[PDB]
């Protein structure tokens, strides 16, 4: 009530920002692994601004797209800076979100009462993948054309509806101008849905507070957000800016394939077709099966397991510090996931078939094993008691 005003920061106009940014209580022992959500928010904002300024000089037609990109880089003041920021900020954004996901896996942040947050995160990941893949096409190089062909013709493996949905997706009989213009419109639209999903994700987290490197109750020792975690976020942002600008200014083409500087030519095929570096685990899992239906329907278990982790209900200790075996399994899963990433960029013959078929088995044994520790360790107090 307070029958006369005290502060501008507690008035109705600034109540929301104050309560959810300035005075919000957080645990006091959060480490540097809790900054990547804000860092990814800044990455998304950078992508949106840079894209809104690139889309003032790009023409979506098969005759003009390549030459309009080169016009941007050669004839507009600073346009090379815009293109390099966009094409490398996509990679930075994926890097940051991968680190975020593995943080969530380590300290077991999916468990109760925070499974709505995990499910919304998985949905956000799907939107991210779709947006990046749709937007790798508009330059209209060789890899754009052939990657679109392979991935979007992988949808005719489905039973009877297959050819119909592929032809409806392509807007015709092959990947041509209609697909280009379609994908441009989808690319301009999806990131705003990404923004909305991010805000919903944050509200869902703020309705219970965050976890901590201990995984215990944390309502007795909390500090506000400003100025104690604002300065830590600041340190993170400046280090990230140094890294990003090392990429932009002194090595802007290391993270791409050289073949996209050759205009699309539907008759000759490249000898080694791959997508970007952040789709290679899925790509390896997908080619690991000698069957179209099995290969396509093996991605579905990946997302089903990622979306069904939170609902096992016997484990009682969250943080992996007090869980040696689950910690070792975490590191071994990380190694196996890197191995899938490396395999996804190789030719398909010996000795890569076996090494492409076993790591999927390990990647699924991870999501199968974890409830077994849940049960076998629920009864641990009764054996080790003193």
């Amino acid at each position: 009530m307070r029958n006369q005003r005290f502060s501008l920061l507690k008035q109705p106009i600034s109540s929301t920002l104050n309560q959810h940014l300035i005075d919000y209580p957080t645990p006091s022992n959060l480490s540097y692994w809790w900054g990547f959500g804000s860092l990814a928010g800044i990455c998304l904002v950078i992508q949106i601004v840079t894209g809104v300024f690139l889309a003032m000089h790009y023409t979506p037609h098969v005759d003009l797209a390549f030459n309009s990109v080169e016009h941007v880089m050669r004839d507009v003041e600073g346009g090379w800076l815009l293109r390099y920021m966009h094409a490398n900020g996509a990679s930075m954004f994926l890097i940051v979100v991968h680190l975020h996901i593995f943080r969530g896996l380590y300290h077991a942040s999916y468990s109760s009462p925070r499974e709505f947050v995990r499910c919304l995160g998985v949905v956000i990941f799907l939107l991210m993948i779709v947006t990046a893949f749709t937007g790798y096409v508009p330059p209209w190089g060789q890899m754009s054309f052939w990657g679109a062909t392979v991935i979007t013709s992988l949808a005719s493996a489905i039973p009877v509806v297959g050819d119909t949905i592929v032809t409806w997706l392509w807007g015709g009989f092959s990947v041509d101008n209609a697909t280009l213009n379609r994908f441009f419109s989808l690319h301009h639209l999806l990131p705003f849905i990404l923004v909305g999903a991010s805000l919903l994700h944050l509200a869902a987290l703020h309705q219970y507070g965050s976890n901590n490197p201990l995984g215990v109750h944390s309502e007795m020792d909390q500090i506000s957000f400003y100025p104690y975690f604002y300065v830590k976020d600041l340190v993170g942002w400046v280090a990230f800016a140094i890294f990003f600008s090392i990429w932009i200014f002194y090595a802007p083409n290391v993270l791409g394939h050289p073949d996209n500087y050759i205009p699309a030519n539907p008759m000759p095929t490249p000898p080694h077709i791959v997508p970007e570096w952040y789709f290679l685990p899925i790509h390896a899992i997908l080619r690991s099966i000698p069957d179209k239906s099995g290969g396509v329907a093996a991605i579905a278990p990946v997302f089903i397991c990622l979306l069904a982790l939170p609902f096992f209900k016997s484990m009682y200790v969250r943080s992996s510090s007090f869980r040696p075996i689950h910690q070792g399994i975490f590191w071994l899963l990380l190694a196996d996931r890197l191995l899938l990433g490396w395999i996804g960029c190789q030719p398909v013959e010996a000795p890569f078939v076996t090494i492409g078929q076993i790591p999927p088995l390990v990647f699924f044994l991870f999501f199968a094993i974890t409830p077994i520790p849940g049960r076998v360790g629920r009864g641990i107090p009764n054996s080790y008691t003193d």
Partner: protein, 242 residues
């Protein structure tokens, strides 16, 4: 192990380094070599004439050189396609009328565009140089179909274009012995400039802002420690043993 093609080594280019720039005399001589040997079948079509002023020629030289050639222009009041000499805002002329003619004149092989030829393959600079200077005698046991030549730096072992860089194929205006290697070096320097005309501005901005942002990182770390000093040295008594 013949389908991939030989590997081109790494050479110490004068434009490599974090604080290195283009050698503009090499750009001049490379442009001369291109316009007198290579423009017979290849084309640039991305580089205009005005790009050269301030980079390898003064303005008047480029103006006269562009006024050498003839290009077409849109309809008059009559409705005809006439021709008039070139200007500063024209692009490097093409030797054929389309790709079909290009394949017809070379035996079904299309000679590509050289604007981005360094960025487009793997390890551009060294690949182009060793490709030019790499025609050699085929190894024992292999043969090449007539109308083709051998080069280990090509994936397949057999290439279509014939060797051009030969001692005395051009005559410079500075008095440099036009050896095959000198000509190849100048050509590669010219092509690298053509592909990446923004390199020097890029490197200047990069150096400046990396330095400045490192200073800001130092300041932010101090700020952080100063704020957290109060909690991180706090002492509390709690009244519990185990």
């Amino acid at each position: 192990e013949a389908e991939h093609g030989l590997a081109c080594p790494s050479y110490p280019w004068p434009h490599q380094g974090i604080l290195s720039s283009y050698d503009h005399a090499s750009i001049r001589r490379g442009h001369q070599v291109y316009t007198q040997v290579c423009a017979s079948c290849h084309s640039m079509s991305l580089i205009s004439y005005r790009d050269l002023v301030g980079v390898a020629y003064t303005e008047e030289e480029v103006k006269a050189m562009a006024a050498e050639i003839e290009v077409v222009d849109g309809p008059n009041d009559e409705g005809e396609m006439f021709t008039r000499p070139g200007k500063l805002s024209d692009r490097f002329p093409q030797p054929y009328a389309n790709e079909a003619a290009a394949r017809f004149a070379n035996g079904g092989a299309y000679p590509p565009d050289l604007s981005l030829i360094t960025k487009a393959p793997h390890n551009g600079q060294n690949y182009v140089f060793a490709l030019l200077t790499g025609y050699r005698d085929p190894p024992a046991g292999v043969s090449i179909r007539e109308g083709l030549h051998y080069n280990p730096y090509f994936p397949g072992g057999a290439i279509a274009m014939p060797k051009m860089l030969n001692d005395g194929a051009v005559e410079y205006e500075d008095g440099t012995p036009a050896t095959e290697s000198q000509m190849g070096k100048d050509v590669v320097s010219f092509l690298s400039w053509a592909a990446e005309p923004e390199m020097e501005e890029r490197k200047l901005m990069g150096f400046k802002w990396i330095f400045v942002l490192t200073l800001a990182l130092l300041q932010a770390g101090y700020y952080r420690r100063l704020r957290w000093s109060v909690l991180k040295s706090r002492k509390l008594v709690l009244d519990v043993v185990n």
